[PDB]
Write a protein that binds this ligand. Structure first.
Ligand code: KXH
Ligand code: MYR
Ligand code: MYR
Lengths: 209, 198
């Protein structure tokens, strides 16, 4: 049947976050969450509606959705919290869970007007824990181009301009079994800014066709 | 050639199968002022300047490739990178490949490889790693160009930086900067390995 959270039977997202720790977190620890996911069917969105927002060739949404499997595809809409003037640590943390032991390859493609501008590919081997395997990609340093982007977005004089800019900014994550090259999870991320007093939020959708 | 006492490159190839080799290394060198190539890689953290500043200086090499983009009778096919290192000490390696366009990093690929004992040494085989899609698309375009001089013009802004570290100790074992031109298929692929100095 049909997904309740961001995951399949073979690979579930446990946690995802992007954050910054101010220079003085060493003395009084804190972190600011730009976005955060911590884990009745999910609503769906037709994948044709977003093809233009990601690349369109090899490793593009259309071609990935063709390779399948269709149930592995999700869309997350984030309301990002950009209220937090620099020199801190900017990080991304990811955690997944499976019942089988695999080695994963996680690709994150940052895209501007649907054109890939950066990419990070990491591999992570399973860790056998409580009747299940865990995959930890914790505290990856954020790419500096993304840090710069955030610094710029945050200075825009109006929220509506932040949203206009973000209209053309997306992230595609594809997780595959490094050994078989099977797709395990594909997540498209689209962004708005949250309104200051509200922190980060998200809504997860299944991508259908 | 491309090596220290702790770690040597044995083979490196990038290729496509339906095997065509775009580049290939199978295993004193001239020296190049690393200063000359700072502008070919980002000045950020993981910048060639900053990596070199730490050292050790004898771990840094430059490879110039004259690539062979003459394949086909052509779309699809498997695009891969195979590398092999070797050593006398037992290690686990973190292999970072950074693809750069006009000095800015556009891809970082991180892989891990554990030593395996063979013929009385340790070998590290990162074989048939799927070439990232950025590069595959890039190569598909690059090959359409009607003249080599045009391929060369495009390639003067395209570089790769590979950093290989001892995962457990975080020590730099090898750092290689790659620059690119195209060869004629008559002449075939070629490379020239240099040492980077400062
Ligand atoms: C650093 C100065 O600005 C740029 O390089 C830049 C220019 N464009 C226009 C989009 C056309 C697609 N090539 N987008 C970006 C950009 C946006 C977000 C990120 Cl996170 C990054 Cl890395 C780059
Ligand atoms: C002119 C291009 C010839 C082929 C280039 C091969 C060298 C690329 C090294 C591979 C590093 C990144 C691989 C990937 O992540 O896709
Ligand atoms: C660079 O290292 C690639 C990192 C890929 C993960 C990026 C996740 C970014 C989180 C959203 C930032 C908020 C933008 C408004």
């Amino acid at each position: 049947w049909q997904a309740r959270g961001l995951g399949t039977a073979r690979l579930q997202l446990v946690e995802f976050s992007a954050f910054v720790e101010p220079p003085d977190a060493v003395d009084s620890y804190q972190r600011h969450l730009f976005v955060h996911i911590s884990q009745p069917p999910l609503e769906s969105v037709d994948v044709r509606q977003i093809y233009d927002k990601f690349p369109e060739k090899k490793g593009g949404l259309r071609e990935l959705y063709d390779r399948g499997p269709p149930h592995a595809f999700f869309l997350v809409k984030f309301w990002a919290d950009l209220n937090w003037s620099s020199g801190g640590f900017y990080g991304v943390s990811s955690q997944y869970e499976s019942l089988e032991h695999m080695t994963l390859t996680c690709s994150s493609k940052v895209c501007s007007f649907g054109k890939q501008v950066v990419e990070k590919v990491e591999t992570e081997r399973a860790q056998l824990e409580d009747g299940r395997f865990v995959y930890r990609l914790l505290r990856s340093p954020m790419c500096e181009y993304l840090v710069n982007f955030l610094h710029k977005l945050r200075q825009l004089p109006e929220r509506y301009m932040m949203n206009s800019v973000l209209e053309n900014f997306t992230i595609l994550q594809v997780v595959t079994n490094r050994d078989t090259q099977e797709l395990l999870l594909c997540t498209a991320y689209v962004f708005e800014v949250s309104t200051s007093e509200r922190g980060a939020q998200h809504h997860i959708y299944r991508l259908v066709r």
